[PDB]
Write a protein that binds this ligand. Structure first.
Ligand code: TA1
Ligand code: GTP
Ligand code: GDP
Ligand code: ADP
Ligand code: ADP
Ligand code: MG
Ligand code: MG
Lengths: 312, 428, 426, 5, 311
């Protein structure tokens, strides 16, 4: 089923001197009210919550499902300086300062480090981005206009995508850094393209000769932008148009899945086309939206809250 | 002096302006070429050689109708730089008229308006003509209104809009544009008059005995109403009233500023005789539910303030008698907190006929501007249409495809619901 | 100022476009040699939409003709109005298409797409404000479907924010001339449903039925069908070159008529249509035209509108008429036939009125519909494809040019997805 | 060449 | 029925045989027929004392590489006394392109073939370094796993259990693995020379090649084994089994020692058999030369049956 999580952050020192104030008021642990308008979610975190609680309440079940022949998907949506990088990567070394991806890879390795020697596992990694409705490869700059097809069992995939092997989490972190060093980011570090990361974990039973394949999807959603209040010109305008249209299409797909409608518009955008296998049915997907409570950023906070609420 | 700046944006506004300027040129005895063979400075400026240049700016994103104006029978009147034209129309998109295509001629029109405003001493207000539902009339108007509010601000602004009808309609995505523009019209405007096609169609059917109306008749009626409004600034008479007194008599609260207009007596040439057309009859007929230009019966509502603008041969004794007869009635109910709910204006200038027109030469006419609580039903119907169409999110990929977020629709819906709630709560 | 680039690919497309150009030149009053002999200023006011200027008051159309055989080219060039086209815009090969989608789209079309794209680019950079592209072809052919699809993909890649409208002839159940038609139809729909802004579905069966029943014709040849198609194509975009009370561009029609990105398939129409010897007994009014337009036997697609509900209807009138009449008719048509329209979309019909009627009439109208009944045409095509794909019949010709079975499977899945989309709202 | 774990 | 290839490479004389005053008795009556003690000794292909490692590789190891690429197990075995030329034949000078023995050339050719074809196939490569010292099993990859037991499978062919498995993707990994094996061989061992002359080193390579689309399964086992000096339980078992097989009497006693069961696959089992006995033309070693020649020629009488490992 669909799970939508929202996280808030404590005000930084760089804005306390300007005298901003909290806008969000909490009720229980599942509702946040801004300007006397309730917003019901699945779970809301506060500033005092640590990373481990978020990981245990948002990622552990999906991480377990991947290693047992099933599939799952995790998104991440927010504006600049809203908590995206802290809740996703954070400090890549600290046992208490790591985000969600390092804990995911740590568990995905420490489970393999315990299942005897009668089982063999394989790990695959791919990293492709979506830019101007054209799929580019972050691990091979030669490829720039890859395509999407289907195999015999009509489960989509992207052909020509570079797919290397890994054996230790350090290699995973290194390839993550290399992939991030090729994305499109405007001038403080404003992302302008969606990113997709794939961890393929498959097991082959040496004795029983049974093969189980499981997939985990990591998606970093770019931020929707109200153009009229910014004054974008030229390429930035095209980027904003594409990002807004893609986010609207994804919202439509998720709403159609949640409401249990007969037809789900899986073929309205590239992003939903790729993730058709690990989105609906017996697939568990969790979405995390990060927001800032400072009154300086109330409008974008409301935009993020509305996008999260669209799923229901 | 007393001057106004006219702006016509979109096809509907441009054609309304065509009719209005025809009427004004007829009223002041100015030939189309601008030579006449002092009660005219309000709408024109002298050039020193006998030519007169009207104070109007024509803006459109499509070169079709402005090209008709440039080559029609009024090509030698307007200033060539007043007529401003783009490349591609708004295509019924709020975003295309607002930002995507708007940010290419808005600076030019602002410069033209500044050039016109510098030339006028006693600026009185703006008279913007646009339409609700179209991309240009709903989106491009918002940008111009915001820029004018930022620049000028304190000057009064009046708008005349074509509102969507209950059943008769032309476009398919009209509710979205109407909701967005009616959100934008409450922050910057001061007194917006709204009309619709269906009520004028019925008015043409019954009173004028015409079964096949077109747009020209509607434009003529709207021009007549606007001329009736501006007559007090143009000419002289006992109990005259200008714009600021209009707004201080007709707008009780900062948000209740959405009146509806009415004209009387609309009659034909054959029915011009056989009727007295006295002051009492004219006054009584203007409160009928069948002569309102918005499809909303005043009986299911209570008035707040109605200002009557008599023009022609009028004597105040008859006006007082008519007001007493109106007050003693039972069908129309006033709010308890407004013991005096009538404003009276009289002028010495009778109406002017246009050649080849359906209107008749009468000795007197009135224009009642009233703001009752009955205007909420049209907004209710439009909101119902919007929510029914937006439940499935149809035609939304076009709007979000031009750099527009999904939150604007919900925000505008919330603002409209707040407006309806405020109107109803102040009604009781 | 809002220019249109026209492309003709295949025999059917070439002949349809030739008839269309003859009709357009007659409407604007242009002699075959390219001189202007009109009788009004409104004709020359907006002549830049389809024509380019030349020395000594001569006009040449902005059209490009592409084919893989040199027979249709010099069949057109020797015709009544072949003297007006630009000779350097003739791009053609020598090897026939062979009724092979794979050949035209991969082997013999990849060696000629470069010249066609070059001449398109040279024509597209001389305009002031490009509006869109027009393409005429037939889905069941070999060069038509493949070449048009390749050109559409390339142009949508180069120009990403322009309207692409194509007038494609669709295969029919009871009228057919090719044995491998369903394969071509499906392989063309697979790309048309993705890289087209609005496409119009026409079939020969409905045109034959129109000629037999309404016009009471004796022996209808291809000329009458091409002429009907030219009439509706001319009536589609009359608001770009003539004034009117309500003006509707191509993008305005696209915005009003397309609720969701996939559903952009339309069935055109026209009115009035009477036989000689019976026009003296007909009253020409708006109600009569409205009744004729919404008749199930007047559409140019062999899908019964009664087996479905209209999503959006656009009706462009031409001539002098009252607006109240048009509004009242478009309201009472919906109210009287409520069960034939989508319930949750108020005002399913859009009105556009222009004040320049076609020569020789007083009133004319074009009907552009978007109904769920278009699913059954795709149903028939898909059933034929399934029947002929289990045995892999006639498949070594396509796989002999560099294709795969997975392409066929993907195209069938996409068509099934389209059918599922249309059925959902019924 | 693969690199299984 | 694949053939058993017996290969005889001669080495230059060392110092002790000169100190005894050896004469160059052996003469090549052709490249396969040789005369010692005035007696002919014919093999498949006899290499001279001046023969290079490159020539021996070209003549011998190509077919076994092709077979293991096809799916048939291959065996390369080295025999001789101490200082007979076994280890230097096996590796020689690994960093030297000329002196590199069977192991570096085999690795280079395998990687060359892999880089050459690179079709829609997947290859998984694993290596295990193994040793036997006074019938003691010890893996150098992990020192603690000693006193391991060789077990049996469903096909009932011997295999070592407990030996550490290490995948390889590039030749440098093979070189580092060999270096680590030798380094661990230097740990808990007093003298490398006596251990080499009294123990046995086993090099194992396994390959699993599978097509991506057709998904056929092809596997192969490669054995690279060097034994101790022939100048003993292991040698008693080897002599008895080789003499019995040449005689074709009774059976081959495999439970005498672990190396016998291990070589069951290599000798008479489901694996291509090819041995390269290293001989010396010295009269100081005429006894051991005679023993080696008789061993090789007796083994040449045996032909094996081998099947492709496809599942
Ligand atoms: C005396 C009179 O009024 O004659 C009419 C006529 O009788 C009818 C039957 C015409 C006639 O049309 C046909 O018979 C016909 C033939 C082949 C294909 C399609 C139609 C007419 O031929 C066609 C002709 O149409 C035009 O003139 C339009 O401008 C039309 N022109 C052409 O198609 C055209 C033909 C030849 C050369 C150049 C142009 C047009 C329509 C849409 C857009 C552009 C142009 C008209 C009104 C008539 C005749 C002459 C009998 C009809 O057709 C049209 C297109 O108007 C058939 O049903 C209508 C109703 C008309 O009343
Ligand atoms: N009174 C009157 N109303 C009109 C006229 N033309 C259009 N309308 C109304 O205006 C609405 C359509 O908007 P338009 O003004 O034509 O559109 P626009 O402002 O030009 O915007 P775009 O054409 O989309 O760029 C409908 O409700 C019409 O009924 C006219 O000439 N007179
Ligand atoms: N209206 C019309 N249809 C045609 C004409 N010629 C062929 N067709 C139709 O087009 C389809 C055949 O494709 P065609 O264009 O001849 O093959 P191509 O030359 O390889 O593109 C069939 O359905 C024919 O009925 C024509 O001149 N006019
Ligand atoms: N949950 C949190 N608790 C404490 N600090 C946080 C939290 N989330 C974000 N921050 C602080 O915000 C700073 C910048 O946020 P960042 O993740 O970089 O946002 P962005 O990636 O949009 O710039 C970080 O230095 C981090 O210290
Ligand atoms: N073919 C040869 N050419 C030159 N030197 C050799 C040759 N074969 C052996 N030797 C040398 O003789 C010495 C002993 O040989 P080695 O291979 O260690 O013997 P084994 O492994 O049979 O005990 C080593 O220095 C070796 O390099
Ligand atoms: Mg317009
Ligand atoms: Mg040795």
């Amino acid at each position: 089923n669909i799970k939508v999580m929202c996280r808030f952050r404590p005000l930084n020192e760089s804005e306390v001197n300007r005298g901003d104030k909290y806008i969000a008021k909490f009720q229980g642990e599942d509702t946040v009210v801004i300007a006397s308008k309730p917003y019901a979610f699945d779970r809301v975190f506060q500033s005092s919550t640590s990373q481990e609680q978020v990981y245990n309440d948002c990622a552990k079940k999906i991480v377990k499902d991947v290693l047992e022949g099933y599939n799952g998907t995790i998104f991440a949506y927010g504006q600049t300086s809203s908590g995206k990088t802290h809740t996703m990567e954070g400090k890549l070394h600290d046992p208490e300062g790591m985000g969600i991806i390092p804990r995911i890879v740590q568990d995905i390795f420490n489970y393999i480090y315990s299942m005897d020697e009668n089982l063999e596992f394989h790990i695959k990694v791919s990293y492709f981005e979506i830019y101007l409705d054209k799929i580019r490869d972050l691990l091979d700059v030669s490829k720039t206009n890859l395509s999407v097809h289907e195999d015999k069992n009509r489960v989509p995939y992207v052909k020509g995508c570079t797919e290397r092997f890994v054996c230790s989490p350090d290699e995973v972190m290194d390839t993550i850094d290399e992939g991030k060093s090729n994305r499109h980011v405007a001038v403080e570090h404003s992302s302008r393209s969606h990113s997709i990361f794939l961890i393929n974990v498959k097991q082959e039973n040496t004795q029983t000769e049974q093969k189980l394949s499981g997939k985990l999807y990591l998606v970093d959603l770019a931020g929707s932008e109200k153009v009229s209040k910014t004054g974008a010109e030229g390429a930035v305008l095209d980027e904003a148009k594409n990002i807004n249209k893609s986010l609207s299409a994804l919202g439509n797909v998720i709403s159609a899945l949640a409401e249990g409608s007969t037809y789900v518009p899986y073929r309205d955008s590239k992003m939903t086309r790729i993730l058709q296998d690990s989105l609906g049915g017996n697939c568990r997907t969790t979405i995390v939206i990060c927001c800032s409570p400072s009154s300086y950023n109330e409008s974008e906070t409301k935009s993020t809250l509305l996008f999260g609420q669209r799923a229901k | 002096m007393r001057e106004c700046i006219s702006i016509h944006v979109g096809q509907a506004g441009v054609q309304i302006g065509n009719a209005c300027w025809e009427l004004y040129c007829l009223e002041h005895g100015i030939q189309p070429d601008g030579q006449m063979p002092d009660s005219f400075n309000t709408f024109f400026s002298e050039t020193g050689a006998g030519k007169h240049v009207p104070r109007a700016v024509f803006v459109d994103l499509e070169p079709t109708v402005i090209d008709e104006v440039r080559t029609g029978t009024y090509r030698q009147l307007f200033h060539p730089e007043q007529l401003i034209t783009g490349k591609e129309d708004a295509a019924n998109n709020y975003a295309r008229g607002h930002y995507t295509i708007g940010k290419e001629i808005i600076d030019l029109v602002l410069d033209r308006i500044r050039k016109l405003a510098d030339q006028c001493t006693g600026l009185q207000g703006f008279l913007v003509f646009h339409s609700f539902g179209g991309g240009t009339g709903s989106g491009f108007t918002s940008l111009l209104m915001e820029r004018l509010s930022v620049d000028y601000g304190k000057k009064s602004k009046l708008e005349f809009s074509i509102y969507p009808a209950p059943q008769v309609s032309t476009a398919v995505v009209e509710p979205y544009n109407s909701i967005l523009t009616t959100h934008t019209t409450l922050e910057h405007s001061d007194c917006a008059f709204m009309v619709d096609n269906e009520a004028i169609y019925d008015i043409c059917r019954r009173n004028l005995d015409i079964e096949r109306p077109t747009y020209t008749n509607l434009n003529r009626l709207i021009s007549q109403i606007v001329s009736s409004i501006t007559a007090s600034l143009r000419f002289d008479g006992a109990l005259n009233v200008d714009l600021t007194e209009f707004q201080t008599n007709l707008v009780p609260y900062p948000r209740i500023h959405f009146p509806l207009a009415t004209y009387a007596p609309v009659i034909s040439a054959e029915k011009a005789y056989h009727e007295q057309l006295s002051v009492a009859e004219i006054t009584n007929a203007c409160f009928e539910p069948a002569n309102q230009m918005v499809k909303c019966d005043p009986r299911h509502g209570k008035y707040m303030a109605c200002c009557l603008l008599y023009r022609g041969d009028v004597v105040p004794k008859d006006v007082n008698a008519a007001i007493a007869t109106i007050k003693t009635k039972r069908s129309i109910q006033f709010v308890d907190w407004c013991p005096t709910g009538f404003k009276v204006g009289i002028n010495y200038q009778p109406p002017t006929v246009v050649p080849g027109g359906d209107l008749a030469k009468v000795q007197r006419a009135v224009c009642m501007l009233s703001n009752t609580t009955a205007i909420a039903e049209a907004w209710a119907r439009l909101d119902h249409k919007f929510d029914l169409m937006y439940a499935k999110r149809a035609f939304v990929h076009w709007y979000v495809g031009e750099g527009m977020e999904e939150g604007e629709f919900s925000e505008a819906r919330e603002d409209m619901a707040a407006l309806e709630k405020d109107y109803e709560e102040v009604g009781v | 100022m809002r220019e249109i680039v026209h492309i003709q690919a295949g025999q059917c497309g070439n002949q349809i476009g030739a008839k269309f150009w003859e009709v357009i030149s007659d409407e604007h009053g242009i002699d075959p040699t390219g001189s202007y002999h009109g009788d009004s200023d409104l004709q020359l006011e907006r002549i830049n939409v389809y024509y380019n200027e030349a020395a000594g008051n001569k006009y040449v159309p902005r059209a490009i003709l592409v084919d893989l055989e040199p027979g249709t080219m010099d069949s057109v060039r020797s015709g009544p109005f072949g003297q007006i086209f630009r000779p350097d815009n003739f791009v053609f090969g020598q090897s026939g298409a062979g009724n092979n989608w794979a050949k035209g789209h991969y082997t013999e079309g990849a060696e000629l797409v470069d010249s066609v794209l070059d001449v398109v680019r040279k024509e597209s950079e001389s305009c002031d404000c490009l509006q869109g592209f027009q393409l005429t072809h037939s889905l069941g052919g070999g060069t038509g479907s493949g070449m048009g699809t390749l050109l559409i993909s390339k142009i949508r890649e180069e120009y990403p924010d322009r309207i692409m409208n194509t007038f494609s002839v669709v295969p029919s159940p009871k009228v057919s001339d090719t044995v491998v038609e369903p394969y071509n139809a499906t392989l063309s729909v697979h790309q048309l449903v993705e890289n087209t802004d609005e496409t119009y579905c026409i079939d020969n069966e409905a045109l034959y039925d129109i000629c037999f029943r309404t016009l009471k014709l004796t022996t209808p040849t291809y000329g009458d069908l091409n002429h009907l198609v030219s009439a509706t194509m001319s009536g589609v975009t009359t608001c770009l070159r003539f004034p009117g009370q309500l003006n509707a561009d191509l993008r305005k029609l696209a915005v009003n008529m397309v609720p969701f990105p996939r559903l952009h398939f339309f069935m055109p129409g026209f009115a009035p249509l009477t036989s000689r010897g019976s026009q003296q007994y007909r009253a020409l009014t708006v109600p009569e035209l409205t009744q004729q337009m919404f008749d199930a036997k007047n559409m140019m697609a062999a899908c019964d509108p009664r087996h479905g509900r209209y999503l959006t209807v656009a009706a462009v009138f031409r001539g002098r008429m009252s607006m109240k009449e048009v509004d009242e008719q478009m309201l009472n048509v919906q109210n009287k036939n409520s069960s034939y329209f989508v319930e949750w979309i108020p005002n399913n019909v859009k009105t556009a009125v222009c004040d320049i009627p076609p020569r020789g009439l007083k009133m004319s109208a074009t009907f552009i519909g978007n109904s769920t009944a278009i699913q059954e045409l795709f149903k028939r095509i898909s059933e034929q494809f399934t029947a002929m794909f289990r045995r892999k019949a006639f498949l070594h010709w396509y796989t002999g040019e560099g294709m795969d079975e997975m392409e066929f499977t993907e195209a069938e899945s996409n068509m099934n997805d389209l059918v599922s989309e249309y059925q959902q709202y019924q």
